[PDB]
Write a protein that holds these residues in place. Structure first.
Motif, mmCIF file in Angstrom:
data_model
loop_
_atom_site.group_PDB
_atom_site.id
_atom_site.type_symbol
_atom_site.label_atom_id
_atom_site.label_comp_id
_atom_site.label_asym_id
_atom_site.label_seq_id
_atom_site.Cartn_x
_atom_site.Cartn_y
_atom_site.Cartn_z
ATOM 1 N N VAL A 222 0.641 -1.201 -0.023
ATOM 2 C CA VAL A 222 -0.067 -0.008 0.035
ATOM 3 C C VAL A 222 0.931 1.343 0.074
ATOM 4 O O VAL A 222 1.570 1.512 0.956
ATOM 5 C CB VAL A 222 -0.959 0.092 1.167
ATOM 6 C CG1 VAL A 222 -1.720 1.489 1.219
ATOM 7 C CG2 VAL A 222 -2.250 -0.952 1.099
ATOM 8 N N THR B 218 1.034 5.494 -0.497
ATOM 9 C CA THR B 218 0.330 6.694 -0.365
ATOM 10 C C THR B 218 1.377 7.884 -0.607
ATOM 11 O O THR B 218 2.219 7.806 -0.238
ATOM 12 C CB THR B 218 -0.479 6.759 0.943
ATOM 13 O OG1 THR B 218 -1.927 6.289 0.652
ATOM 14 C CG2 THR B 218 -0.741 8.269 1.154
ATOM 15 N N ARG C 241 -9.920 -1.633 -13.056
ATOM 16 C CA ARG C 241 -9.019 -2.779 -13.664
ATOM 17 C C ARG C 241 -7.603 -2.922 -13.087
ATOM 18 O O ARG C 241 -7.107 -1.825 -12.822
ATOM 19 C CB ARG C 241 -9.107 -2.931 -15.262
ATOM 20 C CG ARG C 241 -10.238 -3.778 -15.757
ATOM 21 C CD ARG C 241 -9.719 -4.862 -16.232
ATOM 22 N NE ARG C 241 -9.853 -5.958 -15.477
ATOM 23 C CZ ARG C 241 -9.239 -6.749 -14.733
ATOM 24 N NH1 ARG C 241 -8.188 -6.214 -14.528
ATOM 25 N NH2 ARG C 241 -9.649 -7.709 -14.081
ATOM 26 N N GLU C 242 -7.009 -3.929 -12.652
ATOM 27 C CA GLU C 242 -5.631 -4.069 -12.402
ATOM 28 C C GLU C 242 -4.701 -3.987 -13.625
ATOM 29 O O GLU C 242 -5.324 -4.439 -14.761
ATOM 30 C CB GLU C 242 -5.397 -5.488 -11.774
ATOM 31 C CG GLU C 242 -5.915 -5.892 -10.492
ATOM 32 C CD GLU C 242 -5.396 -6.647 -9.507
ATOM 33 O OE1 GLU C 242 -5.618 -7.993 -10.136
ATOM 34 O OE2 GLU C 242 -4.779 -6.511 -8.489
ATOM 35 N N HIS C 243 -3.420 -3.539 -13.416
ATOM 36 C CA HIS C 243 -2.615 -2.890 -14.289
ATOM 37 C C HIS C 243 -1.266 -3.819 -14.005
ATOM 38 O O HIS C 243 -0.686 -3.517 -12.882
ATOM 39 C CB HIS C 243 -2.226 -1.561 -14.424
ATOM 40 C CG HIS C 243 -3.456 -0.877 -15.136
ATOM 41 N ND1 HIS C 243 -4.390 -0.405 -14.130
ATOM 42 C CD2 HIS C 243 -3.807 -0.723 -16.401
ATOM 43 C CE1 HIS C 243 -5.535 0.275 -14.967
ATOM 44 N NE2 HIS C 243 -5.260 0.072 -16.155
ATOM 45 N N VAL D 143 -3.265 -1.040 -8.833
ATOM 46 C CA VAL D 143 -4.528 -0.506 -8.808
ATOM 47 C C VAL D 143 -4.372 1.078 -7.959
ATOM 48 O O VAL D 143 -3.677 0.966 -7.225
ATOM 49 C CB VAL D 143 -5.790 -1.220 -8.056
ATOM 50 C CG1 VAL D 143 -6.721 -0.374 -7.332
ATOM 51 C CG2 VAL D 143 -6.402 -2.206 -9.287
ATOM 52 N N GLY D 144 -4.823 1.975 -8.465
ATOM 53 C CA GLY D 144 -4.354 3.544 -8.185
ATOM 54 C C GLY D 144 -5.768 4.252 -8.172
ATOM 55 O O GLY D 144 -6.463 4.223 -9.013
ATOM 56 N N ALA D 145 -5.929 4.613 -7.252
ATOM 57 C CA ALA D 145 -7.048 5.633 -6.941
ATOM 58 C C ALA D 145 -6.606 7.060 -6.492
ATOM 59 O O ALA D 145 -5.636 7.105 -5.446
ATOM 60 C CB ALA D 145 -8.136 5.291 -5.903
ATOM 61 N N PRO D 146 -7.197 8.171 -6.857
ATOM 62 C CA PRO D 146 -6.835 9.774 -6.326
ATOM 63 C C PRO D 146 -7.336 10.093 -4.864
ATOM 64 O O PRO D 146 -8.281 9.602 -4.545
ATOM 65 C CB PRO D 146 -7.231 10.604 -7.372
ATOM 66 C CG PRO D 146 -8.669 10.006 -7.955
ATOM 67 C CD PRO D 146 -8.306 8.464 -7.979
ATOM 68 N N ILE D 147 -6.491 10.683 -4.136
ATOM 69 C CA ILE D 147 -6.877 11.027 -2.829
ATOM 70 C C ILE D 147 -7.653 12.556 -2.791
ATOM 71 O O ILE D 147 -7.108 13.446 -3.624
ATOM 72 C CB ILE D 147 -5.753 10.916 -1.715
ATOM 73 C CG1 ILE D 147 -5.334 9.569 -1.741
ATOM 74 C CG2 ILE D 147 -6.084 11.569 -0.353
ATOM 75 C CD1 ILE D 147 -3.983 9.427 -0.789
ATOM 76 N N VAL E 137 -3.368 6.830 -3.961
ATOM 77 C CA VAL E 137 -3.243 5.663 -3.132
ATOM 78 C C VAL E 137 -2.768 4.462 -4.463
ATOM 79 O O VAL E 137 -3.480 4.465 -5.305
ATOM 80 C CB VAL E 137 -4.198 5.223 -2.365
ATOM 81 C CG1 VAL E 137 -5.796 4.943 -2.890
ATOM 82 C CG2 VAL E 137 -3.852 4.001 -1.435
ATOM 83 N N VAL F 152 -2.283 0.526 -4.663
ATOM 84 C CA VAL F 152 -2.511 -0.889 -4.124
ATOM 85 C C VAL F 152 -1.738 -2.074 -5.198
ATOM 86 O O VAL F 152 -1.927 -1.928 -6.300
ATOM 87 C CB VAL F 152 -3.870 -1.089 -3.785
ATOM 88 C CG1 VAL F 152 -3.820 -2.744 -3.176
ATOM 89 C CG2 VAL F 152 -4.691 -0.223 -3.040
#
Lengths: 551, 551
Positions: free
Chosen positions: A18, A20, A75-77, A94-98, A108, A110
């Motif tokens: 994980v 950040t 989706r996973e890359h 897997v990536g997401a904006p904070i 973030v 994962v």
């Protein structure tokens, strides 16, 4: 505050890395898994830019902007974590904006270490005894439990009850709605059957549209009542896909078993005959196996289908149609490629749907007879067609063969005689077997494919789905083509998992030296999506309909 | 504060269910995945006891105490999440206690939904083109890349270089230290080979102790220099296991390829011959393939091993030893079970280690000759032994057969004649094949096992490891016994993953109707651990050593 301690313990309980970071790449957090993956502790990494500590690249500029705009937590890359010292770690990212509310403060990531997959022994154990889709027990675990129930010394006071329940509309939903719809329907039928059974009962998914039930130490009447309840309970299901309903029913086969006398193979064969009988007699019913009642009815059915298929052959009522298969690749020059399709007309001249004769012809061992007529009349048609000097030459004639033909030792001699009689080049013939038929008699399918390829014929593996088992089986099946099951193609533009399955089948088929074919290509939008992906060939209503082939 | 927003987004980026609760079970946190799994939102679940919302049970009192005392965040535990309405969700559970410093304030549960595994398309794609242990490309992807490198129209200006590098001490580490040690050694050799190669080069793990390297558009001299560097780089590795070092070396085979002329099969066969030659000539060296130099040396080697094996057969220098296999189950009464082991003495009477003759006998097709001598002298010994009325009767005589015997059509006629000549009951014979030999010629292994079982013989699958491929292969291999690879047993009491692999092989072998055998059982502590697990049979120094069998 104290929230930090709880959040840290929680993120340390996560096996995946994980990470950040801020908009610039400055490291704010790493859990121990991320630390081991990056070769950097948080005490030393905190504040420093990500790219100056390790890299995250594609298989041999920055990924931050892709996360804050393009790619997200869907989706996973597949990526490599380059440690800039101890080489790399293969990962799925897997990536997401904070956010702060409206303001994008960071990102973030994962990261799942691909190399740790071989260490999940509880998951591997689970996967060997369970169906990956429904979560129910699989055929392997079910047969084991049925064998124990029949041979055990303890808790074997009563009689057991074995059930086979086939979902009548599975194929209908899967073909008309797509794979994702078929999967959801099976998951709902699974919930409903679970809800109708008690702890001690085995519920399995045996394959396709078939479920298995074992009621241990169950009185005869109670077992038949439970079956009727489950069957009616399915009729009461209200399955819908994008607002569109379906009337769902099961055909049920029930056999009463006695531990010590009843055999595993006899049990399975009995429940199968009873389930087939329930379908033969209407489809939305239960059929309790009886030694006299079922064997006489199967013997009657055998006699009627021997007469029906031979009379249809004698009265020239079977015919062949041809549907085109076209290359999606640039500057194509291979000659017309077709797949032959069997059609049967009744005594009044009306077309007979395939499910009204093929399941009976398979059940009663009449398929080698049908296959031999198909292959010979295909050769006969190719000769007649060739009389026209202006006729579009056929480069590929794809013909489907049954499991029964796969296991027939005399077929090659029949085929050798057809080549000498009709003079069709073997190279122009592509035989097809479904992935299901091939796996059901693996050794004989391998020998059959190799012998036919030595004759110069080509081979295709039809109704193919991606998976480790499918790709393992594919290693041993020396086919030339891989045909993607149409149910994935049907909804690939609406379902991201069916789109990803098409991409995976294509990529792996190509790695294994196969040329790929997509079926159920009903629109040019689907066709162009398949071309963007790299699929070699397409078949469907957007390409061309089945047309009369034989005279 | 603002830590909450970041922690929530981070835990919402986790695909697994995350549950946080107090010592009593009161729900403090759920991430969206946990909410979907439980069928309860956090707004509605917060504060309420876990067990009054949903259940977490074993496959059909409380789990909290097990987490705070017994079970922890180590191994995954297979559970069912009972929704008390919509039946269940099959999961793998990991649980860890929450602390304030010294005070146990709660618990964290991480739940992986088993049913979501079939949706990981990027992982499935990765697994089909990569080796699960090292993370490198597998044989499939490597051969694909080698085929592209040989047939491609663009970027094909130079000559390519193919390498096969075998780690000389892999078997030594794997057998003496255990599987976990062998895995760690391969991961370190992988890092070192990666570190010595550049982006554009393919590095693969081809199987066991063998790695594959492809240097595209590489001048001849440069390719041979890179090979020598990598080889010396491995010699400089300082591999240790529990303080114990090992001197690691590679045997390297190099072949120069020309795109357009060189063939995939010719390339692979050439690099294989060159790699074998490097081992034949010493083991810690590079052998550059040359058409004259290697074919003459392989022809010389063929001639020398034909003479060596026949002279050893003619001079009665081969012999058989027998090592006992004992049941671990209660009240055993099956008769002495042995496994036969081949031994060879040189002209001076000294024992010859197996790696000094078996790899050459396999390479040069001399194994059917050896197998025929073994089987006949086993039968001959059983007759002689039977002359003694007091001799302990042999119930099982396990004999290992080579891939070459598996593919030999005349073997069954040879075996039928042995049964008529020596009168050994077929039932007392258990033939064994390794999982590797079986998979290398799958169709012929299936037919061979079925034919031998029709004769009344038993069959065993040796050197077995758990995995989806192994269990898929096992579905088609009708063996009676499954023999656990000794490398897992060797360190099962020190490595929790090797212990879990033994448990998985045992559990699945039993589900598939196989009886299980553990080899390398060197202590009674290992023996009792295997008995607690449920393994049927044990073999090793704690059971009994190999003793003279033949005269």
């Amino acid at each position: 505050d104290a929230e930090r301690e709880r959040a840290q313990i929680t993120l340390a309980s996560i096996g995946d890395g994980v990470i950040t970071a801020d908009t610039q790449g400055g490291i704010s957090y790493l859990n121990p898994a991320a630390e081991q993956m990056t070769n950097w502790t948080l005490d030393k990494a905190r504040g420093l830019p990500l790219a100056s500590l390790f890299r995250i690249v594609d298989e041999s500029l920055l990924i931050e902007q892709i996360l804050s705009g393009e790619i997200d937590g869907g989706r996973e890359h597949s990526k490599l974590v380059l440690r800039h010292d101890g080489s790399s770690v293969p990962v799925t990212l897997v990536g997401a904006p904070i956010h702060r509310g409206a303001e994008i403060t960071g990102v973030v990531l994962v990261l799942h270490d691909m190399t740790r997959e071989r260490q999940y022994m509880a998951r591997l154990s689970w996967q060997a005894t369970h169906d990956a889709l429904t979560g129910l027990t699989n055929r392997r675990e079910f047969e084991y439990r049925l064998q124990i129930a029949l041979e055990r010394l303890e808790r074997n006071s009563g009689r057991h009850a074995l059930m086979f329940l086939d979902l009548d509309q599975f194929k209908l939903v899967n073909d008309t709605c797509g794979h994702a719809a078929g999967d959801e329907l099976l998951r709902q039928v699974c919930t409903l059957l679970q809800q109708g059974l008690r702890e001690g009962d085995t519920l399995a998914r045996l394959g396709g549209d078939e479920f298995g039930i074992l009621l241990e130490n169950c009185p005869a009447e109670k077992a038949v009542e439970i079956a009727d309840h489950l069957r009616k309970t399915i009729q009461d299901l209200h399955f819908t896909w994008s607002g569109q309903p379906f009337n769902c029913t099961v055909s049920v086969g029930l056999v009463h078993l006695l531990p010590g006398i009843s055999t595993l193979e006899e049990a399975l064969r009995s429940a199968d005959m009873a389930c087939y009988m329930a379908k033969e007699k209407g489809r939305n019913r239960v059929q309790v196996f009886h030694q006299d009642d079922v064997e006489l009815s199967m013997r009657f059915g055998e006699m009627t289908w021997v007469q029906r298929i031979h009379l249809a052959l004698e009265e020239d009522r079977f015919s062949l149609y041809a549907q085109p298969i076209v290359p999606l690749g640039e500057g194509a020059e291979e000659g017309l490629h077709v797949e032959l399709l069997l059609r049967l007309r009744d005594e009044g001249g009306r077309l007979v749907p395939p499910l009204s004769f093929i399941p009976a012809a398979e059940r009663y061992g009449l398929m080698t007879l049908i296959d031999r007529w198909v292959v010979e009349n295909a050769f006969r048609t190719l000769v007649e067609r060739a009389q026209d000097p202006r006729a579009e030459p056929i480069g590929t004639c794809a013909i489907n063969l049954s499991g029964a033909t796969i296991g027939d030792e005399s077929f090659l001699q029949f085929l050798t005689e057809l080549f000498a009689r009709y003079r069709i080049p073997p190279q122009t013939i592509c035989f097809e077997v479904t992935e299901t038929v091939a796996v059901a008699n693996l050794a004989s399918a391998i020998r059959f494919i190799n012998e036919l390829k030595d004759t110069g014929c080509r081979f295709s593996l039809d109704d193919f789905c991606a998976g480790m088992s499918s790709f393992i089986y594919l290693k041993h099946l020396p086919v030339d083509y891989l045909k993607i099951d149409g149910s994935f193609v049907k909804d690939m533009l609406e379902d991201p998992i069916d789109r990803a399955m098409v991409q995976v089948i294509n990529h792996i088929g190509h790695v294994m030296g196969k040329r790929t074919i997509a079926e159920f290509v009903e629109t040019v939008e689907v066709m162009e999506a398949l071309r963007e992906i790299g699929i070699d060939y397409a078949q469907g209503l957007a390409i061309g309909a089945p047309l009369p082939f034989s005279r």
